[PDB]
Symmetry: D2
Subunit: 328 residues, 4 copies
């Protein structure tokens, strides 16, 4: 394949670091070596995260097209909209965000802390409810909007970012002098796992990318990942077809609903935070973290396996679930 064909606008510090989770690894039995690739610490633009790696491939088209306003959408505690708001300010562009009530949750400060709060400070026009109305709104005002779908996923360039991710991992394995056996990643809108599948199919490891569902609608998410992997594979000239076998999506850790954690989620967030000083959230990472932990605990990983946990970000959202953590 050839990813180099597509321009990348630098929004990050550079390749994200990989750290050993020795204490957690040891706590679970010392039979599986866990690591963490810090996608959550990739930028100075409002904490960044996985959506920021993605945006590096969309920005060029935005500029090439001469757009002056970035428009995106997501739930109230959306990490994506927050990142787009930061990226926007950094580039000198206006920003319109559609924030929808995607979660059956009602916290008193849910629409005033964490991610949404930062977006308002960052100067974005935050519209709480729509998509087309926002876009049209921009034209009618005399500006040219660049449409960024949820999580940047269902977009032509939306999976390029994480194809690069697999690239980076190969380069880093070279340095470490060893290859990771699996990769755990959280999936919801899909292009994160999609890009990984494509990139890792390149070396025969697409099926080693273990996606954990956090949408609680595994069928849709699975299909979207598959569809985007297929479009992205073509885009980058993957010398192969993405098969259903190439898309692994665990469905055991998404409950009870999207945006709502279960007792295991909370326990996972605590264990990880208490053994490594590494925080995860109640919506996404706490769920992928829970999945990985549970997998090791079940013996689902071959002894001696090196698993690379991809921490995609999302911590600011912790502020929207304050009461659940009042005593830790």
């Amino acid at each position: 394949m050839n990813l180099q064909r597509f321009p990348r606008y630098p929004l990050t510090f550079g390749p994200t670091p990989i750290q050993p989770l020795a204490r957690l690894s040891k706590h679970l039995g010392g039979k599986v070596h866990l690591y963490a690739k810090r996608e959550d610490c990739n930028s100075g633009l409002a904490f960044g995260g996985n959506k920021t790696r993605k945006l590096e491939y969309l920005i060029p088209e935005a500029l090439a097209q001469g757009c002056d306003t970035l428009v995106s959408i997501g739930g109230i505690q959306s990490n994506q909209t927050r990142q787009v708001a930061a990226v926007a300010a950094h580039l000198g562009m206006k920003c319109v965000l559609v924030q929808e009530n995607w979660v059956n949750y009602s916290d008193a400060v849910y629409d005033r802390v964490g991610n949404i709060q930062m977006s308002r400070i960052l100067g974005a026009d935050v519209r709480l409810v729509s998509w087309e109305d926002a876009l049209e709104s921009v034209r009618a005002a005399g500006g040219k909007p660049y449409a960024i779908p949820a999580g940047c996923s269902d977009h032509p360039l939306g999976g390029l970012g994480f194809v690069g991710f697999a690239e980076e991992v190969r380069a880093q394995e070279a340095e470490l002098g060893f290859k990771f056996d699996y990769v755990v990643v959280c999936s919801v809108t899909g292009s994160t796992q999609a890009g990984m599948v494509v990139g890792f199919a390149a070396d025969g490891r697409a099926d080693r990318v273990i996606g954990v569902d956090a949408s609680a609608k595994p069928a849709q998410t699975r299909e979207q990942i598959t569809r985007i992997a297929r479009q992205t594979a073509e885009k980058v000239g993957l010398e192969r077809d993405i098969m259903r076998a190439d898309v692994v999506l665990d469905e055991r850790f998404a409950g009870p609903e999207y945006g709502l954690p279960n007792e295991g989620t909370l326990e996972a967030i605590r264990l990880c935070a208490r053994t490594e000083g590494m925080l995860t959230d109640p919506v996404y990472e706490g769920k992928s973290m829970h999945g990985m932990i549970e997998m090791v605990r079940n013996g689902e990983f071959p002894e001696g396996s090196r698993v690379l946990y991809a921490h995609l970000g999302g911590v600011p959202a912790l502020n929207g679930y304050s009461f659940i953590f009042r005593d830790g």
Copy 2:
């Protein structure tokens, strides 16, 4: 000087990057070139920040002495206490925090969001004083069978507490080498003092100690200024600075600290928004929003020589934003 003499436990990713703030620079008139050194993005341990750089030099002593528990203190939204609980967890050490009511502020979720929230998740035993707690906590650890390492507010009034930022100066010189030029000034928020202290010492090494413009956030200028000078001198002796820190070496602007510690004025808010909206770089209403305020105001007043290159140190503190949600409800 010789800083390499003291061991440093890795808690950060490595040197913190310097980024130009061209939009904000241009916004103000294009006469002063503004930059930022991101100490706020120095670690994967619960967002880190300036206190984390400092802790790199206290930990080795904590481990050497075989302590099994880190104990510290700060106000409700303290950044220090959170970093201490992250570092603790990472190190396999227990953690006890004394959170006090240092701010005349009363937000509904003040003690349940931001920094303190993370601390509890991190496993620290977070103790809220009513409404001697310090020695009470230290002893509670001993009486429990452990050995506590005492970390004073901000790590500031501690022998090793200023080493962290002498190294900061070290880092900037090496970076100036690559950049091929030297920064004319540096802006740093100051409250308990060893951050500025370390900078004054480290920059005194090349005669730029007076170029470090401290911006007070304690609203108690005199005390803070004094503590900075005292920690600077103690530290200078610790590293073998080939000079003595003069009172003139400690600069501290008292204009942007109001109205009180932990409370922002309208300038602070304006500053926060302006920087946020022009660079996508967030700052808090307690510390950084004030230093940013000071810098912006300095540039706007022509107090900086035209053509000057001013390096703003972003110390962190953004999570505290959650404790002031209403003020930012409409942005």
Copy 3:
């Protein structure tokens, strides 16, 4: 029947008023005439409510046994614990409250507004337990009572809602009494009565009281517990124990206890879209507010009933407003735009 046998300590202002809900009635078709008996406005003791009516009969005992501390229990936004705390300060007694989280709910200011906020200002010792503690499993109840004694005081035990307590059903039999006296003036009788039911003695007392004139099965209870079976049984149990206590010249039949299960979802403490619509409609047509936990659900019940035609044309339904409005503060996000 003889209720006058038991002493009643004044905690209320006196009989609670009945007001016509003319706009709501007209809005629903004008075919059923809805009224409301304001138990929610029965006292100066921290907003009172149905639980304050019941306490009038328990206090005399607590004082006669010379208890110096009232001890009770309830969820975080329990109305019961708040009224106990007020009544207690008013009488010069100490107060210990065991509060656990009985609701799968997690609002940022849940344990610091509304009812619990008042109990703390009222001087009660509010004992909360972190999630997973299980007061029911550990027995925070008995630990509280013992702690009071160990401290040198004498506690008077008041169970959840006063319901499963010998004197607990007395209060609302008096309610039926009041309603007949008031019906005399009105020159007519209410065909039904809608009341919200959770721990039981409110409807229970009403059943006893109204059985005395053959209207027991006219008391339509709406379940807000989401555990209709247990609730129904406790009502029936409390009603029988209470009937015997007041000398009801009858046996309470399974048919005398009506409990509608259609408006309790999805869980105790959690409202449905219907609950919210009922709250807003009643509020916007009468200036009368109800909560997401209790009243909003009975109100939903009554409205849904009228709209369904389950009420005979011309019927006059008497809605008992038990109180609980303060709990609204625990559900701010839900009402952020109305």
Copy 4:
């Protein structure tokens, strides 16, 4: 005087009850007999309060003029705006409220709990910010006819009637009680509450016995408003006398530090009063008038044997906006 001249639309349950605060009284020395008139429990309309008594005399005009919308104003945690939203709903009228930030305070749920939350549930159109004129005009431009209700109903012709009536009630109740109250403590900010009391008690020569406790932190301005509204009101009811400045007593000692912000004494008073009587007061108004009355008794400023009547004007729901301050009681 003749108050019966003006029509009063029933919005309350009837005369408000008076209760003895025997515990509080004994706690403070037992040398002064404290009582309370529960204006805070006057109506089934969203908790009511003193503003509801005032509204009883404005509604007739509103209806007589055929207005279909009630428009009022006040701070975020305004009691008045809540009471107007409830009254409107009850009357079948639309409601528009101008909520302004009159308090230097910034709690996370300040604009989502207590009074303002109820107003939104009651169906009023709650506008957070010429704001006043803009609302009135938007109503007209919409095809409706708005009835303008100024802050607290105070600077309004009919605004002072409601509490002249309060004095009437007290006289009637003193009759039954077989005795008269020597003083009356009332909280004052916009003014028509104490103003009306001054007029109505002027009738029996007790106007200087109505002790107003300022909660505005701008006593001069508040004192002048009371005096001003009292005079205009006295003329409207035909008081057989003119209201002198000595007729208006306003203590400035307990309004600090600002309007809407309580001091340590406020909090203490709120607790002492709640813990001895089971009667709650808020940190904006009543907690300050309560603070005042307690400090007065504790300082001996009341002659031994006096019977002081505390007017509880309401406002408890505002408590929800100051949650952190009471987290531990």
